[PDB]
Structures are given as C-alpha cells and as structure tokens.
C-alpha cells in the first residue's frame, strides 16, 4: 500500500498550496473537508502537474533558462495535447 502509507505520512506535512485555498476550490465542487490528508494529496497532485509543465517549458527555454514566455508554454503543452492561446486582443 505505498500511497496509503504516503497519505498516512501526509499528516505533519505542509504543502506549497494552503489547505484553506485547496479546500476552497474543493468546496466549490462539492468536495468537503472530511480529512486534511486527502486535501493535502490533492494539493500535491495539482502542484506536480504545474511543476511538470514548468520543467518541460524550462527545457525548451534552455534549448532556445530565466524568463518563461508563451512561446515556451506552447511546445511544452503540445506534447500534453493542450493548445495554449496567445492573448492577441489587448
């Protein structure tokens, strides 16, 4: 039960996103805060998604580090199947 062990360790762990903010967007969708550790695992999963996109974007920036531009998010999300849109109207 590796993940059951991890969730049991998640008590005493503070995630990058607060549980007052992760729990707010969970309450908006009907998910109510029965257990803090479950909120913390959801917060960590969201963090991993954003972090993986960011790291792929940084490999693209290093290939072309420093500033993150929309032309770095565009090929980074293209392997994810997500076509990001430029603003172009402001």
């Amino acid at each position: 039960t590796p993940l059951v062990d991890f969730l049991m360790q998640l008590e005493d762990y503070t995630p990058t996103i607060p549980d007052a903010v992760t729990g707010y967007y969970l309450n908006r969708a009907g998910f109510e805060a029965s257990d803090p550790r479950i909120i913390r695992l959801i917060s960590l999963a969201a963090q991993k998604f954003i972090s993986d996109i960011a790291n792929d974007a940084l490999q693209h920036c290093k290939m072309k580090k420093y500033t993150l531009t929309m032309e770095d998010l565009t090929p980074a999300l293209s392997e994810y199947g997500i076509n990001v849109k430029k603003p172009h109207y402001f």
């Binding site: 999300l77 994810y80 076509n83 990001v84 603003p87």
Partner: protein
Amino acid sequence: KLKLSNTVLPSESMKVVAESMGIAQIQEETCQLLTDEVSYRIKEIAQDALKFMHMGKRQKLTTSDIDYALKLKNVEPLYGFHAQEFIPFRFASGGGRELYFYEEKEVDLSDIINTPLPRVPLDVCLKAHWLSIEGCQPAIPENPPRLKPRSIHELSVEQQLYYKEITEACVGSCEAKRAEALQSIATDPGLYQMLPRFSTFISEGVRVNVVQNNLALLIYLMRMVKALMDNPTLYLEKYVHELIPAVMTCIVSRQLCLRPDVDNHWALRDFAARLVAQICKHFSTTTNNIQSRITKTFTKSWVDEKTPWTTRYGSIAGLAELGHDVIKTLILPRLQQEGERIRSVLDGPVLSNIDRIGADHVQSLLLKHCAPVLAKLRPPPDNQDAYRAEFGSLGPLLCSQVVKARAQAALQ
C-alpha cells in the same frame, strides 16, 4: 421606435488572426464567413449568460456567468488553453485570465511572492431587522432614508427624548454610554431634522463652557462634532457656520483651569480640534470662503506680537495640520521668530507660568513638521551641521527623524 442593428466583429481583425497562424491569402468572402459565425456564438452565449444572471438574482453579468453559459453549450469554460483529449480538465472553469489592456506583459517572479495576500472577507451571516412596524417604516440604519391653532413641535414628544438621552449621554458621565450615544450620532439615518438642535447645543455649549475652561465638557463636544461629521446621511454645510467658530475656539483659546498637567490633554483638545478643522476644510469647499478664511485667521494669530502662548501653541498646531503644501509654503520664512521666542522663554527665570511649557510644545511640533518638509524636498545629504544655517534648532535630531521617516518609506 427601435433602430436595433446586428453588430458583428470586424473582418480586419480576422485576417490578422489568420495570417498569424499560417493561413495566408484568404479572400474577403472567406474572411466575412468567419466573423458572422463567431459573432453569433458571442451573441448566443451572452443571451445564455443572461439566464444565469437573472436566476442568481443579480443585475451585473459576472465573469462566472459565461463559464456556466459555455458549459451549457457543451463548450469547455477554459479560455487560455484548449485540451483536445479533454481528460485533465473536463468542463472545469479555471476562472479566466486576469489580463489587462494597459498591462506590463512582463513581471518579476519574486514580485508576486513578496506582495501581501488580500484579506478573506467575512462569512455569510443572518441578521434580522424591521422593514415595517404596523405599516410604518422605521428610521433604523438598516433602512434607506379668531385664535390660530396650537402648533406642535416638529419633533415627536418621544422625539424630544432621544435628543435628551443622546445629549445626556454625550456629556460623558459614563464612557460606554458616551459611546452608545456616539454610535447613534455617527450612523442614525433619521438624525436630520434634529440637526439644528444638535448644532445649537454644541455651539452654545462651547461658548458657556470656555467661561470656565472645563476640558472634558469640551473634549466630549469635539467628539460629538467628529461623530456628526462622518455621518453620511445628513447635510452639514447648512450648519457649519456654527460648527467652525466652536472648533476655532477650542484651538485658539486660553485655558482658565490649571495651566499644566492637563495641558497634555489640552494639546489633544488642540489635536482633536485641528483634526476636525482640516477635515472641515477638506469637505464643504467652494471658492475662497472656508479654507482661506481659517488660513488667514491662523496666520494673523501667528504674526501677532506677544501672544498668549496657549493661543500660540493652538494656532501653530492648526496651521501645522493643513496638509503637504501648506507647511511647504507658510512655515518657511518664520524659523528665526520661532527661535527668538524659545530663547526669551529660556532666558527669563519665570518658571511658575505656562510660558515654558507652551514654548517646549511649540518647538517640538515645529521641528517635527520641518523634518519631513525637508525629507520630502531634498536628498538626505549633510545631515550633521547644514541645519545650522536654519538657526540649528533640530539639527542632528531632525536628521534622525528624517532617517526614521526614510526607514518607514523602505518598510512601505
């Protein structure tokens, strides 16, 4: 009469989008075909987002109404990105993109971390009140607003009583009462049509309350004036001709009671009076009537030779709290006179009078004002002995005050 039209998006914006994508050489009929399709979908959604506005009982289309109007038409509410697979986010609104027309389009990544987060507001609570008492709407703050016949007072018999409870509470026998009355004055919506009797009670009170210098009676009346001013419902500038000479008298008058000890409060009596005086010159302002009139009286109080030092200290405070430019243009050519007055109090042995206390308070206040007046219009170079060109009043201590102001600016 109805000249309703059909407005569509411009086609010269649709060719810019097409050639910035790799689709070049598009015809005008091809380009007009794009801008009537997408202008219908904007019209189809904004008519469908108006259903959620009415159902939520709002008159303002919020940003979330288009998120539900899009989800209703089986289109993902996501605006910034589009996921072909659709499995990571399935019809989940990300709240749009906080973007502007006048934005910077590049920020530093530690600027967003170091800014303080906004305060989460209060949660929803249920309070009850009364719209109608047997047909009549009460004037509570939860509600918006030949013999000739024997006339009636324009106040209810009951109406006279509050005038009576609030005035007998505002003379400060008990502090929580004082407050209960204070609370009432600052937010009673129906306190108009009683306001002549309050203004007359204030004005008449200060004038027969400076016959014997009763400081509390005066500190309570000044707090009553401050509570009268911040009430948003009542119309005050019909009564300010009684209000202003009362506060000038608190600031520019001699103290008939013990000179020292409560002079600390006396400074606050002049502190509360100068606060409400510059708040009255901030409001009620028309051309060359109110602010310039009190400025002229303050300046001829200052340039008057051989003043009472209580009157001197009060007028100094009054001219001091007038804002940024007023001390920038008025306190400048007068430092030598202030220094000479301080030197006279110092030389003459007389210590049992109030002249020495008045002098110390005036010098401290003038030195603090001069400090930022300097911090505001010059660099902080040569803060050791250059102030000796200005008679050496505050000097290095003034420089230290300027440094403390600079530290506060750095903290901001």
